[PDB]
Design a protein around this nucleic acid. Structure first.
Ligand code: ZN
Ligand code: ZN
Ligand code: ZN
Ligand code: ZN
Lengths: 674, 1266
RNA sequence: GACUUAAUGUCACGGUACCCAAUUUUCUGCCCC
């Protein structure tokens, strides 16, 4: 004899089951949950205390599913997810307090409460402490949370209890024989219940292998990295190989997609890469008579550093982004975002040529930088092609970061007058990285390439001053060319024309001599140029000069733009529209770098518009790091013979007497690799 | 050892928070966030009363920052003695860390101290820092401090009254608004203690070293802000009301009128605008005299007492608190009770969008960054102060949470499950003296948004960061300070209502009513902005010029919180910018305290009385010179100003204004109060306008119908065109609308006309007399239209498609698709054209056949043909019986879009009268001024607006309504039941012909076409203007040359048609066409000389042959519906309708000829209006004929239908062309009145005439009665 | 004096109660035992 309440609860449960189908799209799932939760709330409006227990269970389930359908907008857990979990916890608390007496209903209520609580602890430790969660999980397993062959949530409860140091010895066989148990869950059971390192390792190898085909937004990635963190905290020997295997899986997954070089942010990618780097470094610190294995380990370290340094950031920028525009560009973003969101929701719903690191021309030495937060100290990996050897050195970046922040704060107020802080920063770089001035680390007279890590991208590594009473400038001995990542390097096989192009949209009163009195004549130059003029370059020249102070987006690197006419050309529009710059030297003078990227906070995955020019095939970008008076970049452009040789004699080695002269000479760096 | 007593006074509402110690402070986020606020600690155990104070550590921190800035400005020396850089690092290993960590840039200089500061000798900066003293952090011990900042106590509470927290503080909520979407990401709560009363604090500062006296005193004079407010430091009943509201709500519940409690609370809170006389003198509306039940709201019996008398008793009981407070709290309590009992409409409550983020308490462990900032030597630091006035160009609104929810202390918490019943009534932020307030929070948020726009780049404000943001926007706001400003005006705010129209039925959604309180347009708030820096930025000057109003700027300070409906566009006025020379004139800055709290005097003084060291700023570049203004700010919002010519009455229908004003009338036009300067007060005459909400909703509906986006199931994550250019829950709108203010208003001498309608019973043919209602709209006429000059703003970024959509909406408005205001279906607020202003818009300016007649002829020559010799007598009205066959469509045609297969357009038709037409103007009872000589005589004039004759659209709409309903066998829409015969006419008729209640059971063809309750009709009629014909009917004689004294028009008795209880209702009553007006015209002298001179009516009539032209705008009609409508309008030759007064006397026989028809559609090429040829009209009429055949069971023959034949016999004119034909139609004489048989003396007798024959004779048209 | 601080380090002026809603649908100022 069903009633209106029972039939409405049945309809809500049917809607919840439909939204619990893994084949359901994330966009339709939200509407389905809204309908079911609206029905359930409507029933609760009339039965605040007389509501049946099962309706409360349905409400708690719907709130759990709401919480799992809310994605983190940025780098922090949204408060809406916490609020949804808290509301579900309160509803299930009212379910439990109203003792219906049914054993099955009590078991289901405790299962839902435990699932809500483990997720709430996962995203918020303070409000759902470990002790409270352990007590609740013990109560749930006392209530009958033992069937692992039908409910995956019960397996989750058992694994969470294993993580909390609670004896799950009795249920181990049932957990292992269960068909719904995950590979990672079985590995955790083996490591925690039986402490069988061999079985756990050989069975989690399967999980690491299977992670290749799952997007980084999936839950299994976060859980795997958390398991690695726990293993490292327990000083277990299994974490060293596990980190490397998961890193390899991440490389395989990342390389599959991302034609525009963007990745998904999940807040444990950096931790995973740091653990992989630390594991490979520790494996490289063993006593082996053969040096080939050590060289391979250091090359693996450089591979780890390089694989991290070629992708992008959080999702609110992905949602906002830009309209249709290019059909090829927007399709990739749509596919990537859709697959990532779908994988994220499915995790909880049941269920050109890339040059190798050793492909460096003779007489060139490259330096790879990596800073891992878990170790808290920096790494510098150098590769000398002539000696065909790899070695790495350590340094600390905390005081270096503080000095860089001091210089950045002073510059953003007293740009030209902050040269003393720039000299202090250069001296700090030289002091904290003495290996740059070591003959063994970097041979004298070698052309040095830098692949800086996050906030080292903002440091004038070419302008570092040796830690001596008469310390020599690093620029005086080596030719430095920078690069965001080694994967951005290409081969100069493009055909170079004979023309020079001098675009300009800078404010009137500057560069007047260059435009009217063209020193090199110019062919397709312009004054007050727009994005169309840049897009209309057909034959790739030996020199394209762009003179327009650009702008930055503090969140999306794709929206950093050069302020040309008709709205200016953005970072993404360069990739899609611009085609005629294959192998073209660029003296982009967009009023310093600092205009195009944001201001750093020891995280600088943001890439300037110069790397877009590198991607579209430019042979090199000679930009400016900090704002300088216009005649300096005008003289650089007028330097038409075909960089450190110019800076060496222009006054770049005069930090002792005239810091302002040092300020506006070191500001120029060459981005790109011949 | 000079013990300095320090007096601290505030000039803005400062913020205070509960103390919660230090160890317990970290537990609560609110106290951790408010560490820089004043501290409140309770005294009693009840948590109601306590003491407020400011910790000496916070004052010490402010003074230390002041010393830092003062030394930095003077290159690290004060009064000639050099000071070193001090120390701001605490090593973890050596000792404990300070309880507060800096996390901020530190001003530094080039040392210049002779020796390192030590215990024996320390610089004044080191002495003030208290470095080398005997006191540290590990223990307080005692006063070993070289300098000691004691705890600052609230000096205002100079009594033993034990002040409560409610008396001092008031809770407020502040957002963090997302720049890209315009929606708040989260919020936080704070307590604002009023500076007026509890705004002074006393404390002691004990300094032992005399070497730092001057520096300490100067820093005391230099610290400007503290606890969230500007300051200067000097060295020296509801419970009874709630119970009564509960009683009122319970009385309404037993009266089954709970839904009226919302409007009752709204009206009661509206009475605060009036005086006490609305209650003391009983000035509330008394309702209709013929209502026989009193007012529908103010006469509800509250436990045996009328609601007006109950309100009078409540006022007599609670006059102590005041009229404004009493009305406000009574309305608030009634609204809260109504919300508690009934709540939830849209179910936007799955997850509470409210977020209590508190910057995560700024919790960190491993940063401890010291960032020294060294300004270059020789740089010039100056402070620019900008003083002006914020004039509100539009009615503003600064939101605030409900007073019952704020309640500082025991504040309401949303931690309860089911966070629903979000308040539908919103209050405006006000000062403690009911003065309108612009908080520096909202002003600073608007300034930050505008600087972000001007720069072109900026960050979303991050909370709890360990490093200062160095974006260009954040750099400027760190050196920009403002002031909280209130107006000198304290009158209560107007309450503005909005509804949600259901797109399916174009009717108000149930429970969609919500209200806001808006300040009057024209208030001026003081404006203070200071900028301490080295150079006034171009972006700040650009923002000021954007805000400033000029001859051609209008001001663009979008403050407030309802910018989508154009609320809060302020304009800077009287801008005076002064500057301090902080490098050479800082002693003057300290002496004058930077003119903090005295900016009003600065604004109202000449340059000769300026304080020393303060000079006017003469380098404020103009708008044409700023680059950020021209490129970033100027094209951000582009206005589209235009005027609307409404050639019809306009009724925006203010609802509560009709419940409180003493006019005692149903509907009145909307008007708003406007503030005026120079004679500072509310302007005595309110300005009539169409709400910005109505304007915005009209354009939104037009765009949604054109694109088809309207009527979607939900827009929770929609990216459709309508959501893109009109906003949704997750995005602010890109278009902003303002009021359509009436400018052509003083050209009438009677702006508002009184038009009263009534509903006519279908059976008896007379008015119900209980459904009679009167509207009081603006008197708009075709020759003197109302001009509504409004505007809207368009954000930069629309593509071609979106701008085309906006232009298409404007074109639809010009074409008259969407009339403004209420009663648009009967010709109210019909737009007769539009005139886009040619100044601002450019793209918008660039982006803008034979006679028809029916040849059908209906003979109807049964009886009248044989009467050509000596004539017969026919009873004036007959009845039409169509049976019980009523076909109701459950799949009603909705209004979401223009369906492709459905016709939409406009019918232009001309009306010519065959008999004198009588359309009384019942606005006044003595229009002809004949009541002075004749007492109790009803004198009327022909209906006219602004002195030009026209037929009301309601008349034509009702006449076509009854004709169509009789033609299509629709139900009796306006049947009047509950009348006894002497069943009660309820069971007398079949259930099929009863009026349709809802949309579930279906709608009749008439109810589906012209619409019923909660379903807007698809056919709209307009007023019939006068074109040609003789001006009036002369009737030379004892008349004023254009009027006739009609005979008595007795009430239609529903007993002749139903003589016995067994007899059923005949049907719809129709009136024959005849020339019976001749006898009335010739018997003028013998009709007013008889008895009963009060029941006769004298009114203006006009001769036959007058041409009236009106429009019938149809929309989304089926193929056959348009044909049926055309047949109703022009049913062919020798067939005409009856319209106006005196139908039984033969007056008002009107023939309608369809002059033309037009039809528009939607095409990819943007096809305009096109007129159909005769063939299409014939096809529509034929298909309507086949539809009628289908319902029943080349040239159409309508007389084949049994009931259409009777209808056309009823509406057949015999004198159209037959000169010989002239039937005589008269009402039979009761007894000995005018016998020049045919008498009621023997007509009901069974022997004379049986009932069954007389009922049949009444149902057969043109049946002779002899 | 406690209530009520800690001191060589308080950007909380470090955050816009902000975002979406046509007071409107329906009604001839009509008329005889
Ligand atoms: Zn000192
Ligand atoms: Zn910022
Ligand atoms: Zn939409
Ligand atoms: Zn009906």
């Amino acid at each position: 004899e069903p009633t209106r309440e029972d039939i409405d609860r049945k309809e809500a449960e049917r809607l919840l089951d439909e939204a619990f189908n893994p084949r359901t799209k994330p966009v339709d799932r939200k509407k389905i949950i809204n309908s079911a939760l609206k029905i359930l709330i409507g029933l609760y409006k009339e039965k605040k205390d007389d509501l049946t227990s099962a309706s409360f269970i349905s409400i708690a389930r719907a709130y759990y599913l709401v919480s799992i359908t809310i994605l983190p907008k940025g780098t922090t857990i949204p408060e809406k997810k916490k609020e949804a979990l808290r509301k579900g916890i309160e509803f299930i608390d009212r379910a439990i307090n109203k003792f219906n007496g049914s054993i099955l209903d009590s078991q289901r209520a405790f299962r839902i409460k435990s699932v809500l609580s483990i997720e709430f602890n996962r995203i918020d430790r303070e409000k759902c402490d470990n002790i409270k969660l352990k007590n609740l999980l013990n109560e749930a397993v006392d209530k009958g949370c033992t069937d692992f062959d039908t409910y995956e949530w019960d397996i989750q409860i058992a694994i969470r209890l294993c993580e909390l140091g609670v004896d799950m010895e009795g249920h181990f066989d049932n957990l292992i024989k269960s068909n719904k148990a995950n590979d990672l869950q079985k590995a955790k059971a083996y490591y925690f219940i039986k402490k069988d390192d061999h079985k756990a390792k050989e069975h989690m190898d399967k999980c690491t292998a299977s992670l290749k085909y799952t997007p980084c937004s999936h839950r299994l990635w976060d859980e795997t990295v958390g398991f690695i963190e726990r293993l490292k905290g327990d000083s277990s020997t299994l974490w060293r190989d596990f980190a490397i295997k998961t890193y390899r899986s991440c490389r395989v997954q990342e390389k599959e997609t991302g034609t525009l070089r963007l990745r998904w942010y999940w807040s444990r990618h950096r931790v995973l890469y740091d653990m992989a780097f630390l594991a490979v470094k520790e494996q490289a610190d063993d006593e082996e008579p053969d040096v080939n294995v050590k060289q391979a380990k250091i090359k693996k370290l450089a591979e780890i550093s390089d694989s991290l340094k070629s992708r992008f950031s959080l999702r609110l920028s992905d949602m906002e982004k830009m309209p249709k525009s290019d059909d090829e560009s927007n399709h990739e973003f749509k596919k990537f975002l859709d697959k990532c969101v779908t994988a994220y929701q499915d995790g909880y719903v049941i269920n050109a040529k890339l040059l190798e690191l050793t492909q460096v021309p003779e007489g060139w030495v490259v330096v790879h930088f990596y800073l891992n937060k878990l170790e808290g100290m920096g790494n510098a990996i150098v590769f000398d092609k002539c000696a065909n050897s790899w070695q790495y050195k350590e340094f600390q970046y905390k005081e270096l970061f503080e000095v860089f922040l001091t210089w950045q704060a002073n510059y953003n107020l007293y740009k030209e007058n902050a040269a003393e802080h720039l000299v202090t920063l250069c001296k700090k770089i030289g002091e904290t990285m003495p290996f740059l001035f070591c003959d063994n680390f970097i041979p004298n007279g070698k052309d040095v390439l830098f692949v800086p890590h996050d906030f080292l991208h903002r440091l004038p590594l070419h302008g570092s001053i040796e830690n001596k009473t008469n310390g020599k400038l690093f620029l005086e001995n080596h030719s430095c060319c920078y690069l965001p990542a080694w994967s951005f390097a290409s081969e100069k096989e493009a055909s170079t024309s004979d023309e020079y192009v001098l675009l300009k949209n800078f404010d009137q009163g500057h560069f007047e001599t260059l435009q009217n009195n063209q020193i090199w004549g110019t062919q397709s130059v312009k004054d007050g140029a727009s994005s169309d003029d840049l897009e209309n370059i057909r034959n790739n020249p030996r020199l394209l000069t762009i003179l327009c102070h650009g702008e930055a987006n503090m969140s999306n690197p794709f929206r950093s733009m050069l302020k040309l006419a008709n709205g200016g050309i953005t970072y993404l529009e360069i990739l899609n529209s611009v085609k005629g710059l294959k192998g073209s030297q660029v003296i982009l003078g967009a009023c310093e770098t600092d205009l195009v990227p944001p201001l750093s906070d020891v995280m600088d995955e943001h890439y300037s518009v110069a790397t877009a020019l590198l991607l579209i095939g430019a042979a090199g970008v000679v930009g400016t790091m900090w704002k300088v008076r216009s005649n300096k970049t005008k003289s650089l452009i007028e330097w038409k013979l075909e960089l450190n040789e110019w800076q060496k004699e222009t006054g770049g080695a005069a930090y002792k007497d005239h810091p302002p002269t040092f300020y506006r000479s070191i500001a120029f760096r060459s981005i790109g690799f011949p | 050892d000079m013990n300095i007593t320090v007096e601290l006074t505030f000039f803005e509402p400062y913020r205070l928070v509960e103390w919660f110690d230090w160890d317990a402070r970290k537990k609560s986020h609110s106290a951790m966030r408010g560490q820089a606020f004043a501290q409140w600690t309770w005294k009693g155990k009840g948590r109601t009363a306590g003491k407020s104070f400011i910790t000496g550590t916070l004052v010490r921190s402010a003074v230390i920052k002041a010393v830092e800035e003062l030394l930095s400005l003077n290159n690290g020396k004060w009064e000639g003695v050099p000071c070193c850089n001090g120390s701001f690092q605490t090593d973890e290993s050596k000792g404990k860390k300070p309880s507060f960590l800096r996390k901020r840039h530190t001003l530094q200089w080039q040392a210049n101290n002779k020796n390192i500061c030590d215990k024996e000798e320390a610089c004044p900066f080191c002495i003030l820092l208290g470095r080398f003293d005997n006191a540290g952090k590990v223990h307080e011990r005692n006063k070993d401090y070289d300098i000691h900042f004691s705890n600052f106590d609230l000096d205002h509470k100079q009594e033993k009254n034990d002040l409560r927290l409610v008396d001092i503080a008031s809770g407020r909520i502040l957002n963090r608004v997302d720049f890209d979407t315009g929606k708040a990401k989260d919020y936080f709560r704070t307590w604002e203690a009023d500076y007026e009363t509890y705004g002074t604090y006393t404390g002691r500062i004990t300094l032992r070293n005399e070497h730092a006296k001057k520096l300490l005193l100067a820093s005391l004079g230099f610290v400007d802000k503290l606890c969230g407010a500007l300051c200067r430091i000097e060295v020296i009943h509801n419970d009874e009301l709630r119970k009564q509201a509960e009683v009122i709500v319970e009385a309404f519940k037993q009266n089954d009128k709970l839904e009226k409690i919302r409007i009752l609370a709204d009206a009661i809170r509206t009475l605060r605008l009036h005086g006490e006389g609305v209650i003391e003198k009983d000035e509330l509306p008394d309702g209709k005299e013929e209502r026989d039940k009193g007012h529908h709201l103010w006469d509800i019996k509250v436990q045996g007492t009328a609601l007006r008398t109950k309100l009078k008793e409540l006022w007599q009981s609670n006059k102590d608190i005041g009229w404004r407070k009493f009305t406000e709290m009574l309305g608030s309590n009634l609204y809260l009770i109504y919300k508690k009992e009934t709540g939830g409409v849209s179910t936007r409550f799955r997850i509470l969008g409210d977020t209590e983020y508190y910057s995560k308490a700024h919790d960190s462990e491993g940063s401890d960054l010291f960032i020294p900032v060294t300004p270059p030597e020789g740089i010039e630091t100056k402070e620019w102060i900008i003083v002006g006035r914020l004039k509100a160009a539009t009615p503003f609104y600064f939101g605030v949470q409900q007073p019952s929810d704020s309640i500082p202390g025991k504040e309401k918490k949303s931690e309860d499950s089911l966070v629903i019943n979000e308040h539908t009534s919103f209050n405006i932020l006000l000062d403690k003296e009911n003065r309108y307030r612009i908080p520096r929070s909202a002003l600073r948020g608007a300034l930050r948004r505008d600087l972000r726009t001007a720069f072109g780049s900026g960050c979303n404000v991050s909370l709890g960061g360990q490093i200062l943001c160095n974006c260009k926007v954040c750099i400027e706001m760190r050196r920009i300070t403002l002031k909280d400003s209130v107006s000198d005006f304290s009158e209560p705010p107007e309450i503005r209502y909005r509804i949600a129209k259901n797109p399916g039925t174009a009717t108000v959604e149930d429970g969609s009513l919500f209200d806001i309180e808006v300040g009057p347009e024209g208030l001026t708030f003081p404006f203070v902005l200071r900028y301490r820096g080295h150079k006034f930025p171009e972006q700040l000057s650009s923002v000021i010029r954007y805000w400033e109003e000029n001859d051609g700027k209008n001001g663009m300070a979008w403050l407030g919180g309802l910018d989508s409906t154009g609320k809060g566009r302020f304009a800077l006025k009287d801008i005076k910018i002064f500057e301090w020379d902080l490098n050479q004139k800082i002693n003057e800055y300290i002496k004058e305290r930077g003119m903090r709290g005295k900016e009003k005097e600065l604004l109202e003084m000449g340059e000769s009385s300026l304080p020393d060291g303060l000079i006017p700023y003469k380098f404020f570049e103009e708008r044409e010179c700023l680059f950020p203004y021209k490129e970033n700010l100027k094209p951000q919002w582009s206005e589209v100003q235009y005027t609307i010519e409404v050639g019809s009455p306009l009724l925006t229908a203010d609802t509560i204004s009709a419940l409180t004003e003493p006019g005692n009338r149903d509907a009145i036009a909307y008007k708003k109060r406007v503030y005026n300067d120079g004679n500072n007060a509310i302007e005595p005459e309110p300005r009539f306008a169409v709400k910005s909400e109505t304007h915005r909703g009209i354009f939104r509906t037009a765009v949604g119908r054109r694109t088809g986006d309207l009527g979607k199931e939900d827009h929770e994550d929609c990216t459709c065109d309508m959501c893109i250019i009109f906003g949704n829950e997750h995005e602010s709108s890109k278009i902003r609308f303002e009021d359509l203010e009436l400018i052509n208003g003083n050209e009438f001498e009677k702006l508002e006309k009184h038009i009263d309608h009534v509903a006519i019973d279908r059976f008896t043919g007379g008015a119900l007399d209980k459904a009679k209602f009167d509207t009081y709209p603006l008197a708009g006429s075709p020759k003197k239209p109302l001009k509504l000059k409004g505007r809207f703003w368009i954000k930069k970024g629309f593509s071609g498609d979106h701008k085309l959509l906006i232009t298409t909406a404007l074109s639809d408005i010009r074409d008259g698709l969407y009339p403004l205001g209420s009663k648009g279906g009967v010709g109210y607020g019909w737009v007769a054209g539009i005139s886009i202003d040619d100044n601002v818009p450019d793209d918008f300016k660039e982006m803008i056949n034979g006679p028809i007649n029916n040849d059908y002829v209906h003979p109807g020559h049964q009886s009248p043909k044989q009467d050509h010799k000596n004539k017969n007598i026919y009873y004036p009205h007959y009845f039409l019986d169509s049976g019980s066959k009523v076909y109701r469509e459950k799949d009603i045609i909705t209004h979401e879009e223009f369906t492709e297969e459905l016709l939409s357009g406009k019918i232009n038709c001309k009306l010519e009268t065959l008999t004198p037409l009588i359309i009384p103007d019942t606005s006044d009872e003595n229009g002809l001024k004949l009541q002075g000589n004749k007492p109790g005589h009803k004198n009327y004039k022909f209906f006219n607006i602004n002195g030009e004759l026209m037929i009301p659209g309601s008349e034509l709409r009702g006449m076509l309504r009854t004709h169509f309903e009789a033609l299509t066998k629709s139900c009796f829409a306006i049947f009047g039941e509950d009348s006894t015969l002497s069943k009660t006419l309820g069971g007398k008729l079949d259930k099929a012909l009863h009026p349709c209640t809802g949309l579930s059971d279906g709608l009749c063809p008439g109810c589906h076409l012209f619409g019923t309750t909660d379903y807007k009709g698809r056919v709209k009629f307009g007023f019939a203007k006068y074109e040609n014909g003789p001006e009036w009917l002369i009737t030379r004689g004892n008349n004023p040359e254009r009027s006739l004294t009609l005979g008595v028009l007795e009430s239609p008795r529903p007993a002749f048609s139903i003589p016995d209880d067994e007899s059923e209702i005949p049907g719809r009553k129709f009136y024959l066409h005849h020339n019976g007006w001749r006898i009335i015209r010739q018997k003028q002298l013998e009709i007013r000389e008889t008895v009963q001179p009060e029941r006769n009516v004298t009114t203006e009539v006009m001769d036959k042959g007058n041409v009236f032209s009106f429009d019938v705008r149809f929309e989304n009609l089926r193929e056959w519906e348009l044909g049926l409508l055309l047949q109703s309008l022009d049913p062919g030759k020798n067939i005409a309708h009856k319209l106006g007064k005196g139908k039984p006397y033969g007056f008002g026989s009107v023939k309608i000829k369809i002059d033309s028809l037009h039809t528009f559609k939607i095409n990819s090429n943007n096809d305009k209006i096109k007129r159909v040829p005769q063939s299409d009209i014939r096809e529509y009429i034929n298909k309507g004929y086949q539809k009628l055949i289908e319902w029943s069971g080349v040239l159409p023959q309508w007389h084949v239908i049994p009931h259409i034949d009777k209808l056309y016999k009823l509406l057949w004119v015999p004198f159209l062309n037959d000169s010989k034909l002239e039937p005589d139609v008269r009402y039979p004489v009761l007894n000995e009145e005018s016998k020049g048989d045919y008498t009621y003396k023997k007509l009901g007798d069974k022997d004379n005439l049986p009932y069954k024959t007389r009922v049949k004779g009444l149902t057969t048209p043109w049946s002779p009665w002899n």
